[PDB]
Structure 1
Amino acid sequence: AAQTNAPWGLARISSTSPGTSTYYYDESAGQGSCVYVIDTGIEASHPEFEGRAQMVKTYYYSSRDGNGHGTHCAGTVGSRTYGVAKKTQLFGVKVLDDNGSGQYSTIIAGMDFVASDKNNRNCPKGVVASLSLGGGYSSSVNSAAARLQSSGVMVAVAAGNNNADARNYSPASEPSVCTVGASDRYDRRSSFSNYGSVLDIFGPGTDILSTWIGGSTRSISGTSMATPHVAGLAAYLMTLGKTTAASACRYIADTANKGDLSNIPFGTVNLLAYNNYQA
């Protein structure tokens, strides 16, 4: 399948070179997989989700995305026009308030919730979790992400936007989950993207067009935007049977575009998420 005039990020993950405009992908599109978007919520009503998005848990007086961040992230995972895995099931877990903030105790609870709730869901091709969030180093937050991964979920987390070593941020610094840095459309490291040995992979993160609340769209930037590219790619690959939750991060690193990015500091991987689709 091919999507003409796709957002640059989608074209990027189906090409070996930057600058193209078509997203090439296998028509299975992540059908039968599930991605939990652990964020500010999802506007499940948005036409771009086509009925495939639903809230399953909230930690605040409402389950609505009153911010947009989580809807944008969910859109990059699986919306029809802006999403990597266009037939995946999307589940919303609102651990962040409508200012985009949340306590670590709430984020940990949301992660433990997903580890259990996936046993309530029909996800025959496997389960992914996308965490476009983080703060300073916490052993407890890192452990929560490691438990979620251990329970059989492919965990993808943002490296952070501090232009610093992600070793000092959580859950970015957890070794057993997939930590995602951000690149721009010219294959440069995004100016804000964290870096360091704990990163596993880069994804498109600068000027990413996706869904927004109120049934709209917008382009924003962040490692928050790169993480759902990798999460959706994992769900796409698990539907294709090419990997599993336990191995997807390594498989994506195995099959990434290598050495294509500029301004990668010494000791940080030079790997860019890539679907290696051959029509």
Structure 2
Amino acid sequence: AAQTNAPWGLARISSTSPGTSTYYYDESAGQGSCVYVIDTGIEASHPEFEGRAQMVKTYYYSSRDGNGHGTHCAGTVGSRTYGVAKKTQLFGVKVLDDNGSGQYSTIIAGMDFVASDKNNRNCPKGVVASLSLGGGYSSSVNSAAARLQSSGVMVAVAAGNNNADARNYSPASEPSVCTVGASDRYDRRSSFSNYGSVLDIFGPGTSILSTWIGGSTRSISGTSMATPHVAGLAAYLMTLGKTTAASACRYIADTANKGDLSNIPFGTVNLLAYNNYQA
């Protein structure tokens, strides 16, 4: 399949070079996989989700996304126009309030929720979780992310937006999950992107067009935006049978575009997520 005039990040994920505008992908498009978006919620009624999105849990007085950031992330995972895996099922877990904040205890509860909840869903091709959030180092937060991964969920987490070593942030610093840095359309490390040995991969994170609340769309930037590209890619690859939740991060790194990013600090991987799709 070919989607012309796609957002730059989608085009980048299916290209060996920057500067193109068509997204190429296998028509299976993540069908039979599921992705949990653990965030401010998802506006499931957005036409872009085509009935494939649903809220499954909230820790607040509503499951509505009153912020937009969860909806944006979900759109990059699996919306018809803005998504990597255009046929995946999307499950929203609202651990962040409408200001985008959340107590670590709530975030941890949300991760343990997903580890159990997947047993209540039909995801024959596999399960992914996208965590576009983080804070200071916490062994408890890292342990929760590790449990989620261990349970058989491909966990992708944002590296963080501090232009600093991600070793000091959680869940970014958890070794067993897939920690995602951000790049821009000219293959530069995004100016705000964290880095360090704990990073596994980079994805598009600067000026990313996706869904927003009120049935709208929006371009925003962050490692929060890079993470769902990788989560969607994992779901897509699992549907193709190329990899599994336990090995998807390794597979993505193995098949990434290598050495193509600029301003990657010595000691950080120079790897950009790539679907290796040959039309």
**Fold-level match, TM-score > 0.5?**
yes
How many angstroms does 1:256 deviate by? 0.1
Q: Give the match's secondary structure for 1:214.
A: coil
Tell me, in whole angstroms, the C-alpha distance in 2 between the residues paired with 1:18 and 1:102.
Answer: 36
Structure 1 residues 172-200: Cα deviation after superposition (integer angstroms, max 9, x where no partner) = 00000000000000000000000000000
Measure how far apart 1:108 and its partner are: 0.1
Query: What RMSD in Å do the two structures reach over aligned CA positions?
Result: 0.2
Question: 1:52 and 1:59 mapped to 2: Cα distance?
Answer: 22
Cα drift, residue 254 of structure 1: 0.2
Aligned to 1:199: 199
- State the Cα distance separating 1:202 from its structure 2 match: 0.0
SS of equivalent residue, structure 2 residue 218: strand
CA distance in 1, matches of 2:121, 2:97: 25
TM-superposition CA deviations, 1:186-220 (whole Å, max 9, x none): 00000000000000000000000000000000000
Stretches of structure 2 that go unaligned for 5 or more consecutive residues are none
How far did 1:98 drift?
0.3
The residue aligned with 1:244 is: 244
The alpha-carbon deviation at position 277 of structure 1 amounts to 0.2
Aligned to 1:62: 62
**Take 1:106 and 1:91, find their aligned partners in 2: how far apart are those partners?**
17
Question: Could you tell me how far 1:14 is from its partner in structure 2?
Answer: 0.2
Distance 1:54 1:121 in 2: 12
Cα deviation digits, residues 7-45 of structure 1 (max 9, x gap): 000000000100100000000000000000000000000
Q: Cα distance, 1:265 vs. partner?
A: 0.1
| TM-score between the two structures when normalised by the length of structure 2 | 1.00
For residues 222-244 of structure 1, what are the alpha-carbon distances to aligned partners after superposition, in whole Å with 9 as ceiling and x for unaligned? 00000000000000000000000
Alignment gaps of 5+ in structure 1: none
Q: Output aligned runs, 1:103-118, within 5 Å.
A: 103-118=103-118
Q: Distance in 2 between matches of 1:252 and 1:121?
A: 25
- Residue 249 of structure 1: CA displacement? 0.2
Q: CA deviation at 1:140?
A: 0.2
Separation in 1, partners of 2:52, 2:2 = 21
Task: Render the CA deviation track for 1:102-121: whole Å, top value 9, x for unaligned.
Answer: 00000000000000000000
Shift of 1:152: 0.2
Counterpart Cα distance in 2 of 1:175 and 1:231: 17
> Which secondary structure state, in structure 2, belongs to the residue aligned with residue 62 of structure 1?
coil
Q: What does residue 143 of structure 2 align with?
A: 143
Q: CA deviation at 1:268?
A: 0.2
SS at match of 1:202: strand
Q: Deviation string for 1:81-129 (max 9, x for gaps)?
A: 0000000000000000000010000000000000000000000000000
The offset of 1:262, in angstroms, is 0.1
Q: Once the two structures are aligned, what percentage of the paired residues are identical?
A: 100
Distance 1:62 1:54 in 2: 14
In 2, the alpha carbon distance for the partners of 1:187 and 1:5 equals 19
For these two proteins, the number of residue pairs brought into alignment is 279
After TM superposition, what 4+ stretches of structure 1 lie above 6 angstroms from structure 2? none
TM-score normalised to structure 1 length: 1.00
* Cα distance in structure 1, aligned partners of 2:208 and 2:182: 11
Other-structure match for 2:170 = 170
Cα distance in 1 for residues equivalent to 2:273 and 2:51: 27
SS at 1:105's partner residue?
A: helix
* Partner Cα distance (2:48, 2:153) in 1: 25
